[PDB]
Prior knowledge:
Sigma factors are initiation factors that promote the attachment of RNA polymerase to specific initiation sites and are then released. This sigma factor is the primary sigma factor during exponential growth. Its activity is stimulated by RbpA. This is RNA polymerase principal sigma factor HrdB. Belongs to the sigma-70 factor family. Helix content is about 55%, strand content about 0%. It contains five helices and no strands. The longest helix has 20 residues. It binds one DNA strand through loops.
Amino acid sequence: LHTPLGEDGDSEFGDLIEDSEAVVPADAVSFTLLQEQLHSVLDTLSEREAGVVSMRFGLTDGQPKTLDEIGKVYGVTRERIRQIESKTMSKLRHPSRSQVLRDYL
DNA sequence: CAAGGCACATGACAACGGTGTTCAGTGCCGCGTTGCCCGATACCCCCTACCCGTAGTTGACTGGCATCCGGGCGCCGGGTCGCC
């Protein structure tokens, strides 16, 4: 990386290649706005529906939880949880609570 | 002419009429919370073409590789040699 870069002075091949680990502020703030808007639309729905979808898709922890995995803290059945998840997906699929999330993809 | 005797109706007397109520029970027929029964997918098993580490190869075969310049200036600073 300390090669002359073909230039006798003031240059180094080590100062011409961009990295990839660096966080792009644009993408980061877009993600933050996505998180806030999704949390807002999530609060718009019922608090119970909100909580169950959040725990299923893991919106507070990195790893999502399985259906029956939610039926221990909340004390519900593996098929009840599936049913409320299904009707949550049905409601969120409504064009009402989709537009604000369309551009986010 | 006054008193005593018989009709019809009359102050109460309950019990039917008929309807809408008090409990009360149990459903009737609309909305909800959890039983099925499976089906798939993560976790053990064996071996094997290849990757990676180590062991030898008995004519002899005994000192490399250098650098090499047109700064240029200028100073500091000390070391080495000279003076004596």
